[PDB]
Each structure stands twice: as structure tokens, then as C-alpha cells.
Amino acid sequence: MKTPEDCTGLADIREAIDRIDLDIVQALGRRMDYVKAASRFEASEAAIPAPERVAAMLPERARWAEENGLDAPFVEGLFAQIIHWYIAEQIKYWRQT
Amino acid sequence: MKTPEDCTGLADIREAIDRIDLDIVQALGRRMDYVKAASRFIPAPERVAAMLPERARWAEENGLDAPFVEGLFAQIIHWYIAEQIKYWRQT
Ligand SMILES: O=C(O)c1ccccc1O
Ligand SMILES: O=C(O)c1ccccc1O
């Protein structure tokens, strides 16, 4: 995997983009492992959506986006979506267990 | 970070989830560098069309719902295409 400035054409660019997208998928898959592990440390079902934790999480991700040359609303939006889905998945996991 | 099974409480879980979320942001930041580098070689229709099912498959292989993951990548790919177009027009 070449650095962007050493990419010689679109084959190199795409190999690197494929690797980075797969890394993101694999990281989301590991993230689910952690979210499911959380379910045993939840006092109750009402504990799941942990609103102070989520409330703080999104602006922190918006800050990381700004520190990584990305538009904050785009990245904060993506994480709102991921967090929503993972909460729903945790609630599903907690209910079926 | 501890593995999920070795996490002892929500402190451990959160530390690991924050480090993973930071990893994803950092990776998206690197991804932009590649999309901007590509500009000199735009919506590349056949490329997008093939990429999405590939990401759906990776999702299935990592125990995530494919529609949710494919939907995220559809959004990511649209945003980056626009940013590549912006970069190409601005330069
Ligand atoms: O996905 C998360 O990071 C999350 C945050 C707070 C509560 C439940 C969750 O799944
Ligand atoms: O983000 C992408 O993966 C992409 C793919 C094809 C063309 C332009 C792009 O930004």
C-alpha cells in the first residue's frame, strides 16, 4: 500500500481505498463486539441508550473530524447513524438474552 | 485496549470504542487524501457500482448487517465524490 503521493494511477489509489474501507468495516465489526460486551454492565434496559455518554460522544467525533481534515457535520452525521444502529442492536441483544 | 471479553466494566468498553471511533475517523481522513490524489488520473460510475456490493459483502463477513453498512458507504462515497469534484474545480 502506497502513500497517496506515491500512487502511480488509479490501480494504486483503489487498492489503498479498498484497504481503508475494509479496515473501517473490520473496525465497525470489532465495535459491535464491544457494544455487545457492554450489555452485561447495564443496570437495566433503560440504561442502554446512555444519554450523557452519547451526548458527549458526537461533539468529540466532530472534533476529531476537524483534526483530520474532514467536514464535522458529515462525520458527526455518520456517527449519529452508527450510534443509533448500535444502540438498537444492543437493545435487541439485551432483549433476546 | 482490552479485548471485549476482558473488559471489566464500561470504562474499558468506552475506552475501546473511543479508540476504534478515532481509528475510523483517522482512516476517513486518510481516505480523503487518496481521493484528492486520484483527481489527476470523476464520479467513475463502474467503480462506485462495483464498490458498494463489495462493502456489503465485507459487512456480512464481519457480522454486520449489509444494508446498514452499504448505506453508510453510499453516503461516504457520495460525500467524497463531491469533495473530489470540489478539489478538481478549485485546482
Ligand atoms: O454505540 C455506542 O457507542 C453507544 C453509546 C452509548 C450507549 C450505547 C451504545 O451502543
Ligand atoms: O470515494 C470513492 O470511493 C470514489 C470512487 C470513485 C470516484 C470518486 C470517489 O470519491
What are the structural domain ranges in chain A?
A: 1-97
Q: Is any Cβ of chain A less than 8 angstroms from the Cβ of B55?
A: yes
Residues 6+ apart with CB under 8 A from A79: A57, A58, A61, B21
Report the CATH architecture of A1-97. Answer: Up-down Bundle (1.20)
**At CB < 8 A and 24+ separation, what contacts does A2-10 make?**
A4/B33, A4/B34, A4/B36, A4/B37, A5/B37, A7/B34, A7/B37, A7/B38, A9/B41, A10/B38, A10/B41
- Please state how this structure was obtained: X-ray
Instruction: Please tell me the distance from the alpha carbon of residue B63 to that of residue B75, in angstroms, as a whole number.
Output: 21
Residue B21 at interface with chain A, using a CB cutoff of 8 Å: yes
Opening angle at CA A4, ends A75 and A61, nearest 5:
15
Q: What is the distance between the alpha carbons of residues B80 and B82, in angstroms, rounded to a whole number? A: 5
- Which cell goes with B64? 454486520
First-to-final CA distance of chain A: 42
Candidates 1.10.540.10, 3.10.450.40, 3.40.50.150, 1.20.59.10; CATH matching B1-91 = 1.20.59.10
Strand, helix or coil for residue A43: coil
Q: Which amino acid is at B35?
A: V
Could you tell me the resolution of this structure in angstroms? 1.8
Question: Which residues from chain A sit within 8 angstroms of residue B21, using beta carbons?
Answer: 31, 57, 61, 64, 79
Distance between CA atoms of residues B8 and A9, nearest Å: 47
CA-based angle A81:A75:A6, to the nearest 5?
A: 130
Residue B87 has φ and ψ, to the nearest 5°, of: -60, -40
Handedness of CA B71, A22, A49, A46 (dihedral sign): positive
Q: Could you tell me the CA-to-CA distances from B79 to A30, B31, B34, B35 in Å, in that order? A: 25, 12, 14, 11
